[PDB]
RNA sequence: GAAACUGCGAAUGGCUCAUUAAAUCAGUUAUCGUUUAUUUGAUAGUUCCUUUACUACAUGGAUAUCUGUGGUAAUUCUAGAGCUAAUACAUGCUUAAAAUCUCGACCCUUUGGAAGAGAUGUAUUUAUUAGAUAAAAAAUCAAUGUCUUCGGACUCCUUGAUGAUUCAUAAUAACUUUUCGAAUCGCAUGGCCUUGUGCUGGCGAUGGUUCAUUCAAAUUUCUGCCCUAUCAACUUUCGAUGGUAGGAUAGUGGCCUACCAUGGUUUCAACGGGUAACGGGGAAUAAGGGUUCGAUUCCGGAGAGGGAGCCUGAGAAACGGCUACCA
RNA sequence: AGGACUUUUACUUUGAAAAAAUUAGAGUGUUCAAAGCAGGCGAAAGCUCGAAUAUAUUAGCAUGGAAUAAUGGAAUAGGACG
């Protein structure tokens, strides 16, 4: 019943448009997903022209990508720490797009260990030669090592759990992280 | 009317899906994406090397220019990130064989790459519905001043 | 129930799938050879342009 | 209206089907198919009206059902099939073959055309795209999606479908000085040569056309269909070859060619 | 061949002009801003997951129709029992090769180079990359690749479309309460002889993923509306104008939310009021200019007593579809 | 067929467009006409011409013209060329 048509809005001038053509079905708007954390519970909604949509309320784990070396891993979302739209969602732990969350960060950790093996937080000859050819190029920046020692990664979700049903995003990295940590220090 | 900070608001401002690799040691300013709107319209160098973001930029944003191309005169440059253009014309009343001066107010969205002010004639182009009322993106400031190119008088 | 007509239909479906796959791969190979021929021709033209200029 | 519309009132039918404004409240709405209904021609109209082989709807239904009509080598047993421009209608009885080309008055004229050339069809290229797994394909005006075309076949071009296998036989490249047909507007049925194609940056290409009688006009590029090289059309042009004789010239033709 | 299940239409058509004055509508654009049953043209080997033990010569259970027992005063009211089917509901099998990615039982001193092992169809979601291209030569440093007829040469690099794109498409990493990839029907039942129910085998009908095309549907640019100032300022705390992010949308969009900015229209008549106003194609009238009408044979829009709300579908805020209030 | 700069209009010619029905109007003995898109001609042995055109005066698109009407250049030269 929630319409999104322009008739109920006043005109650009400001006149109050008279009621006309009681609102249709191709103008409908559905309830917000306002997703939460834990006990995966995705509800299908049959939208216009089939095309099953998936509400992703109560979602706990999802895929997350690392842009620098470009590797994606399934990992757990552990709470939301910042939201650019409303801090009310942060207090209620409501998870929507562009929200900033914390990551269990283990899968990235032993992927790094089996990939470079630099022992963050503090063999076959083929792997040794791969590492030698690598020649310590893994000079990834300092803040990501800081929260690796902390153990929880700072990520920004990029998927839309309200529509897609997934919980995908990417880790804050580079000046990105910089910006947001300032904001977090504003919160701190 | 433009903030000194390249991002001023709470949300971060990035061009979506263009990524600068921090692990790389090239250390250029950033990776700024851009395009030319065509129609033989020159992308401004202020947009070419600029640092603004402007999601709805015809040159750097996702919006595309297609359809009507309207030339008008600026009547209000003094609301944020958007312009109000006065388009004048003559409606032909045929019962008298006489014309009638008329005007319309077209809202549009001027990119920060352009420096607009009250009185500049502007070429603007059609695009997607950007807001409730703006449907055009400013594409050229033809008359930057018009009669204010020369200001002082020192012989 | 198992009927020789049903087995005939199953065999027809399988054979049609295999034959369509073979035809598609043959068409892909022919298009690749045509692209190679065209590329060789225009590369020879480019070499002649470079030599003449 | 809430949903699609499935009725075509008689006055709302195109004036090229040119039915009788009386003797019926409705007109045959062409079913969805290879051509726009405004541009297409239902089989019932082509048989009952144009050919008069039938008398009414039941007769057309009986004709189509027993598989005597063959549109482009396929049966098409539905009454309101949109047999559009350049399609081939084959009747094994009377062993006759028709190709739909506009007569210069601008109408789907009955064009009796030979069996040997009826094996193939011509088509305009409306799109050239790259489908999944990187396979190039070409979309013609019929909606035929021909896979693996010639690498230098471009949009607005013309091509020669063999109509049996449905693949690419030959093609003609759109450029100046080329025999051409017109498929819309005031210049329906006209045939000429492309003199110039003004680009018009931003949309709605236009082309200038000069016919054999040395008359000149201009038409939109969407409205244009290259048909061959001057003096060598790739099809059999209808009677009159679309010169668009003046009304006074038509009167002179009526007066001169006259025997009773 | 009744009945019933299944499938499809029932959203077309027909009627009326009540609401509606930049609203509808007309002409003209746009969708590089989206959904699209159907029709038409194409479209997929991988469903194996360690393949040295499986139904693929066919997997399971209900369920209407029906047989019988009722209830109510009655309604296209149906509860209990007993069987029974599918293109209904559920599962699920083959099945190649190839190439590309990843991980190594070793050796032999570099140009290191190799036994071998797992994944890769499509669909979805997210990150990243390619998607080029104005034109002749260099030196150098590093990295370090081919061949070396051991001087060193590197000569060869593939790239579609529009006016424009983050487009089409391809590639890597992953993701999925894992979509599809024919356990379906008719006719004719030919050929091979491995002469058996063996091997194959034609014409169709329904389905079926994706991409097109068509019928469209939604929005959408410019301009155009009758009378009235005894309607001059109107709109914004409750969105009014704009910004950003999110939600919702099929999709753009204050369409909604959160936080900001204080904006937008107006003497070129905004806003308000009236219309015994649906808009138009057109009708009457006719020197020319015009005046009046247009509820109605065509195109659009809206409505089914007034209001709201919604299931099914591709398409309804349907009303010869339901839910509730008011009359 | 490509880079390059484009003073901008108002005006006017031409064209593409302005759905059919309606208006105009061509052909045609519906027995005439209102109408309709029919029909006509063979020897009677299948052969046929049709279903013409114009206008819409606004808005948009293209195009040729440069009088009439308006705006803009170079005055601090920050002007034009090599
Ligand atoms: Mg209707
Ligand atoms: Mg009013
Ligand atoms: Mg890229
Ligand atoms: Mg893409
Ligand atoms: Mg938004
Ligand atoms: Mg009324
Ligand atoms: Mg009316
Ligand atoms: Mg009226
Ligand atoms: Mg009334
Ligand atoms: Mg109507
Ligand atoms: Mg209704
Ligand atoms: Mg009543
Ligand atoms: Mg249906
Ligand atoms: Mg209703
Ligand atoms: Mg009724
Ligand atoms: Mg009804
Ligand atoms: Mg009902
Ligand atoms: Mg008309
Ligand atoms: Mg008359």
Coordinates of C-alpha atoms (C1' of nucleotides) and ligand atoms in Angstrom, one line a residue, chain E residues 17-18 278 295, ligand 9:
Chain E
rC17 C1' -17.9 10.9 -17.9
rA18 C1' -18.3 11.2 -11.6
rC278 C1' -13.0 14.3 -19.2
rA295 C1' -21.2 13.1 -22.8
Ligands
LIG9 MG1 -21.8 15.5 -17.6

